[PDB]
Amino acid sequence: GSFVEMVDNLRGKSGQGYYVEMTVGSPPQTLNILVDTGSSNFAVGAAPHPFLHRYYQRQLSSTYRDLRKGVYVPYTQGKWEGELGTDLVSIPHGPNVTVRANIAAITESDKFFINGSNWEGILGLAYAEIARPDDSLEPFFDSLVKQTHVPNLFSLQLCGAGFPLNQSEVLASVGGSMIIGGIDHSLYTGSLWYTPIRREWYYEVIIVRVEINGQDLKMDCKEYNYDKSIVDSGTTNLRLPKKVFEAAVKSIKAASSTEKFPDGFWLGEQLVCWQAGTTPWNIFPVISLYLMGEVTNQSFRITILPQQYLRPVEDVATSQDDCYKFAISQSSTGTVMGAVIMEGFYVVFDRARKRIGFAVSACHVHDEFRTAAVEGPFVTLDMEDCGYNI
Template identity: 50%
Template sequence: MKLTSQPLVLWRKGLSLAIIVNVLMNIALTPCQGKVIKLKLHHGRRHTDFTTGQRSKRAAQNLHGQSGEGYYIQMDLGTPPQKLNVLVDTGSSNFAIAASPDDQISKFFHTNESSTYEDSGTSVYVPYTQGDWTGELATDMVSLPSLPNITVRSSIAFITRSSNFFINTSDWQGIVGFAYQEISRPAGDVEPFFDSLVKEGHVRNLFSIQLCGAKALANSPSLNLSTNSMDGTMLLGGVSETLYKGNIFYTPIHREWYYEVVITDIHVNNESLKLDCKEYNYDKTIVDSGTTNLRLPDKVFQALVKSVQDKVNIPDWYSSQDFWSGTEVVCWPDLVTVYTGFPTVSVALIMTNNTFFRLTLLPQQYLRPVQDPSDPTMSGFCFKFGIASSTAGTVLGAVLMEGFYVIFDREHKQIGFAETTCPPRGSSSTGPDSKISGPFTQADKHLMSQCAYKKPDQKNGSLMVVAYVMAGVCFLCITPLLVMVIQYQVRKCRGRPRGDNSDTGNLINR
């Protein structure tokens, strides 16, 4: 839905005034037997038909990573191909690869060794929530091992400088953004990699992601982060029935820039936080695989922390504020104590005008396994709180996505969630996996439609004053001239009054 802003209303008013003045001037300057000018108004509507196609029945794990450092996929770039790993990020749109040495990475793309590299001569700067980079825009050939026999020329930013962007233990050397072109840098005019694949007809306009998180918890008696790698699967153009179980629940994409969706409520142990639903979406809610935590606006975050604290059921439990802020690690000798002592957290998403569904996260998801910084060899289970405060809206990051199979159905402008077939984080004694429930009916559908946050334009007041002042000045300047022209036209059409022979004679002599 495109919202109408006050500046646009003012612009339309100004345009209307200009049209009226123009019409009056045409009337005034038209000969007595004036002609009629007809303006044709064109109204177009584009219809697009989509076919569902069949689900892919073959899905091999092609995503890898380390806990808290993101998921990457291998790509072949250039001619001859150079193999590099790139972070999969649904929260950005640029495709960027390291093209110069950096202390945090072991390899980079050598532009001078690719015969298909074509520089555009344009620089680009991209900042993230943490870190930034600067690069040179160019194009080159790209293929993925998971998409055999498919090669596409893609726009790529080749990174020449970065700050706090690369992670020396992550094993990825670039990033590929899967969000919409509108947020691509520098000005929304760089075609994203996935858009290029769709445009050339290689894949359907959808993709799906299964993030399985840290697997050491399921297979080790103690948390050994040296083997605590993450795996997952990404399918471009398809959905695999082997990656989910049960039904797929879809929520509409509210706006196509980030993958923006709308939350209707948040529960802790089935108890609502009871906030205005706009607070959950302040100033947007996005699904972002490139962000580790579930991030919430500060007011929502504080309410959730208080509710979780009130419901923790662990004997002699104590934690400082640093644990809830995500900066302190807490360790327990066994998983059962942790996973049965913390409450569930549920996020409700709009389904239709009056229905919604809930994504329920267990402690297995929002308690993020980490290494004890004071004793890396410690035998036990150490965690950070995987829910954090945000100043840039709600972010449904990897902590939430790891509980589900997520389908980015761009064809139908919706995002699907289904229960994942990833191995459980703990043993069967630690409880079930995260669940989806619904659909539920909301009695007041108007309330749900109002949950999306509408950002006010702080410039409305000043723009309104400027617009009215300019309109007034224009009117004062044009009015005398308009009156004179109209009087002249009237006199020319009707002739001079009787008795005014001097002017008549002058006109005849001419």
């Protein structure tokens, strides 16, 4: 561990997202910010809202600069509108630098802020191509790298607890680490394996094979990346393209057939509970995603356990039972490797070398019989054909 100042600087959980503390303005205004590798804007609440107990007050910052331009950001689950500007920004438990970055001051929103999440803004870590209004609005990390000597790379260790965390607990627990500008060896075990970043917009990758307990899903690999596959700290579930989801669920049901679960469970709608300590992890299969390697015709695989894809939730009666929701769901916008994948691994976003690294996380949840894994290499042909083209 060479970055002790940044280790354990995250808080939160997959259901509400993971956040890091940041400061904006002069004097510094502290805010908690959602870490999102699935978007590219730095936006913070800048007006009163029922679910916020603090927000960015531009009139109190001597270094605030108005860009005199609005920004509207509508998405599937919600939306927000803001006013663009720039200000000095820092990350207390991060690199010891202060940079002038773009900030979308959120003045109106719908279904964005969450009651009890404890975060007041979002940090989009993806590329400029997907920044709103357009790619001319420089993303925070781009500014950080351009204005300082911080290496163009960051790594994330998202730590799921393995059990439900109440309001007080989630506030006092360490949710993981975001190492800005480097890789901390204390956050993973084994080796790091890299997959190429296919294109720099979202953090796009290419999946070349999928197994459920060693059994090949056997679909045309293009299906696995239709219409794209991305790594997103801002998505709770492992989301799969409709046809892949259908085949995967069928296989997971078959592997766990000694126990029957209601359709609502598989739809991610209702929870399933077991007497305290008796969750039958062993009847559920491990899932392996093979990713294109850096060497020609070479791939590697990352394997997760049900301890990753069964999300712990508190029982409706807050009993002593151990309950979960199935965290794999369908998508009409490609594969999304969300917290379900990320909680099992230390993930290195090596922007400098256009690649993403994976290693078994020192904080992944497992049992005495199985562990998450990152293994390689495997001989794989025509992997370029697995990538989708409109």
